Amino acid sequence: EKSPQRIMHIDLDYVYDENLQQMDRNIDVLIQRVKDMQISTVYLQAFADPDGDGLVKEVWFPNRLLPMKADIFSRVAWQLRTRSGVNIYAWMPVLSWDLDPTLTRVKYLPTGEKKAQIHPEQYHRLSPFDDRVRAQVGMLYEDLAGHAAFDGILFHDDALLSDYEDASAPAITAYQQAGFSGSLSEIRQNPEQFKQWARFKSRALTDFTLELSARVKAIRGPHIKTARNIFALPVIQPESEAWFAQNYADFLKSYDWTAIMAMPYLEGVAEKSADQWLIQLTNQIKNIPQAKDKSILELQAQNWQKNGQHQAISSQQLAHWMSLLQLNGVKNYGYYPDNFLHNQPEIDLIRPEFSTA
Numbered sequence: 001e002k003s004p005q006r007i008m009h010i011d012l013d014y015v016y017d018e019n020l021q022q023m024d025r026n027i028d029v030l031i032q033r034v035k036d037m038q039i040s041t042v043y044l045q046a047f048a049d050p051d052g053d054g055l056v057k058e059v060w061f062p063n064r065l066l067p068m069k070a071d072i073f074s075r076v077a078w079q080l081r082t083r084s085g086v087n088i089y090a091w092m093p094v095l096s097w098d099l100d101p102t103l104t105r106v107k108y109l110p111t112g113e114k115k116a117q118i119h120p121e122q123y124h125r126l127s128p129f130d131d132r133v134r135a136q137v138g139m140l141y142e143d144l145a146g147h148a149a150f151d152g153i154l155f156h157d158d159a160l161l162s163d164y165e166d167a168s169a170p171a172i173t174a175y176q177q178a179g180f181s182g183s184l185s186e187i188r189q190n191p192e193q194f195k196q197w198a199r200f201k202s203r204a205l206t207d208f209t210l211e212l213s214a215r216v217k218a219i220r221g222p223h224i225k226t227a228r229n230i231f232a233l234p235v236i237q238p239e240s241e242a243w244f245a246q247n248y249a250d251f252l253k254s255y256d257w258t259a260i261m262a263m264p265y266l267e268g269v270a271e272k273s274a275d276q277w278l279i280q281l282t283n284q285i286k287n288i289p290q291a292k293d294k295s296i297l298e299l300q301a302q303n304w305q306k307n308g309q310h311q312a313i314s315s316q317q318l319a320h321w322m323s324l325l326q327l328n329g330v331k332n333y334g335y336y337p338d339n340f341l342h343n344q345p346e347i348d349l350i351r352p353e354f355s356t357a
């Protein structure tokens with residue numbers, strides 16, 4: 001991978017159509033669009049997410065555990081790799097799979113309540129502390145690896161845990177065997193243990209992704225690159241690892257690419273403060289030598305609204321943000337999501353700040 005990295009992060013939900021001939025045309029237009037953009041890399045959705053409900057029930061590749069909505073991941077991937085001139089990372093959930101209900105789910109401990117529960121507004125994650133979960137998610141990644149050729153894996157941002165998670169019984173067991181108390185409330189009120197517990201959860205998640213990476217590499221070979229999405233807060237306010245279980249230095253040591261969700265509006269930043277926020281993000285990154293050379297900053301191309309809808313970020317604003325990143329010494333970047341159906345973002349408007357050529 002010769003620098004700079006310039007990433008289009010692409011959902012296939014848009015490309016899918018019940019009409020095979022329409023889906024044909026959609027794929028052709030998408031292939032041409034990526035070709036015309038002239039960038040280095042596509043992060044390509046391997047799972048279906050038609051409702052954005054935080055749980056994957058269907059995927060775009062044949063496999064042993066979940067329905068295949070349409071066999072299109074490999075079809076799009078090989079054409080992007082040969083015709084559009086890009087590396088492809090298979091974008092996969094780490095935890096949020098609609099598998100066997102007897103599999104342990106991540107739970108949180110509600111204030112004033114005895115029994116752990118599933119947090120309503122979080123990804124519907126399986127617990128990485130359940131060995132059956134590790135095996136089954138492993139099978140999904142092996143099925144992907146066996147049925148499609150690609151250049152990398154992008155691990156989804158659903159590999160996170162809050163400061164009241166994971167409260168499930170297998171997680172509790174894991175903490176106890178690691179030397180912590182079985183009571184989350186107790187851990188949370190101990191200065192040293194709370195710090196250590198956050199770190200433990202971060203490593204647990206990272207280790208799980210590395211197990212999955214090894215499984216993929218066993219099949220496709222060791223040349224496969226790894227990337228993982230990290231939330232902005234663990235980068236800019238590292239103490240936030242306490243409620244994300246993500247650690248930036250850990251990502252930098254563990255993956256080829258750390259894909260930072262550099263998305264001010266997602267983080268509640270006022271429109272007029274977005275430049276300052278992006279600049280401060282780049283500043284924090286440069287506190288770690290070579291971090292920028294191992295990080296991709298993913299800008300948002302949509303603004304996601306409270307009531308479930310989203311609207312486009314203007315292409316001119318996206319281009320300005322890209323200009324800003326370059327001027328602050330950040331050369332590796334991209335955006336999410338892409339919408340070929342409406343040429344959003346507008347190829348002609350963003351290419352001068354985006355394209356490698």
Ligand SMILES: [Cl-]
Nearest residue numbers: 167168169170
């Ligand atoms: Cl449980």
